[PDB]
Design a protein around this motif. Structure first.
Motif, PDB file in Angstrom:
ATOM      1  N   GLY A  28      35.799  31.557  40.787  1.00  0.00           N
ATOM      2  CA  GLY A  28      36.966  31.987  39.329  1.00  0.00           C
ATOM      3  C   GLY A  28      37.188  32.927  39.323  1.00  0.00           C
ATOM      4  N   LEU A  29      38.157  33.156  37.850  1.00  0.00           N
ATOM      5  CA  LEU A  29      38.667  34.574  37.723  1.00  0.00           C
ATOM      6  C   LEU A  29      37.775  34.757  36.030  1.00  0.00           C
ATOM      7  N   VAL A  30      37.243  36.483  35.730  1.00  0.00           N
ATOM      8  CA  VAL A  30      36.678  36.700  35.198  1.00  0.00           C
ATOM      9  C   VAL A  30      37.706  36.978  33.855  1.00  0.00           C
ATOM     10  CG1 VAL A  30      35.738  38.267  36.583  1.00  0.00           C
ATOM     11  CG2 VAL A  30      35.897  39.105  34.597  1.00  0.00           C
ATOM     12  N   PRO A  31      37.827  35.702  32.577  1.00  0.00           N
ATOM     13  CA  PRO A  31      38.386  36.284  31.426  1.00  0.00           C
ATOM     14  C   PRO A  31      38.598  37.068  30.670  1.00  0.00           C
ATOM     15  CG  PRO A  31      36.712  34.238  31.075  1.00  0.00           C
ATOM     16  CD  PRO A  31      36.331  35.561  32.396  1.00  0.00           C
TER      17      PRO A  31
END
Length: 193
Positions: A1-4
């Motif tokens: 998943g994307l690191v925000p």
């Protein structure tokens, strides 16, 4: 998943080697601003070897982070005395991991900070180490359990090259575990740029 988020910093689970480096008492952390970073393969025990770099660091006036296999004996004690006396602002932690992965992760730090690992094989000697072998970063935060290297100053190209090299190894790996450990190094490098 994307690191925000953006760059938190390169973090590894090795803490301060002495509670007398605690720079920030309210939190129990070590906070070095624009520190030089010393990277050593072997352990630092004798005080005769650390002196040369230490006095040059002392003359320059900038804080220092030492990452070595281990920092002990009189070397540690000398760092403690000098830091308490305010002659040098120094913190020392252990290199993360062990074996070939310790070696590899040390080189990751060096590349990230533009430092040079003092290895016995390449002709170096800790006593001969200089200020140009030292790496740099905007800030280093050291807790009881972790060390965080924020914004290394290494060349963009070299860091990228180190990330590509790791990516070559991930595709050549043989297991999820090996792949995830190499992937962890990539995350660490990305975190501290």
């Amino acid at each position: 998943g994307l690191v925000p988020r953006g760059s938190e910093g390169m973090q590894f689970d090795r803490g301060y080697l002495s509670p007398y480096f605690i720079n920030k008492p309210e939190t129990g952390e070590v906070e070095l601003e624009s520190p030089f970073i010393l990277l050593v393969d072997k352990k630092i025990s004798n005080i005769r070897e650390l002196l040369p770099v230490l006095e040059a660091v002392a003359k320059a006036g900038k804080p220092l982070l030492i990452i070595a296999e281990d920092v002990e004996g009189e070397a540690l004690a000398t760092l403690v005395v000098n830091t308490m006396r305010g002659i040098v602002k120094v913190a020392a932690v252990k290199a993360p991991g062990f074996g070939d992965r310790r070696k590899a992760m040390l080189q990751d730090i060096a590349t990230l900070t533009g430092g040079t690992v003092i290895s016995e094989e390449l002709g170096m000697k800790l006593e001969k180490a200089t200020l140009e072998d030292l790496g740099q970063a905007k800030r280093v935060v050291i807790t009881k359990d972790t060390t965080t290297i924020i914004d290394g100053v290494g060349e963009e190209a070299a860091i990228q090259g180190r990330v590509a090299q790791i990516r070559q190894q991930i595709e050549e790996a043989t297991s999820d575990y090996d792949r995830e450990k190499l992937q962890e190094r990539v995350a660490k490098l990305a975190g501290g740029v």
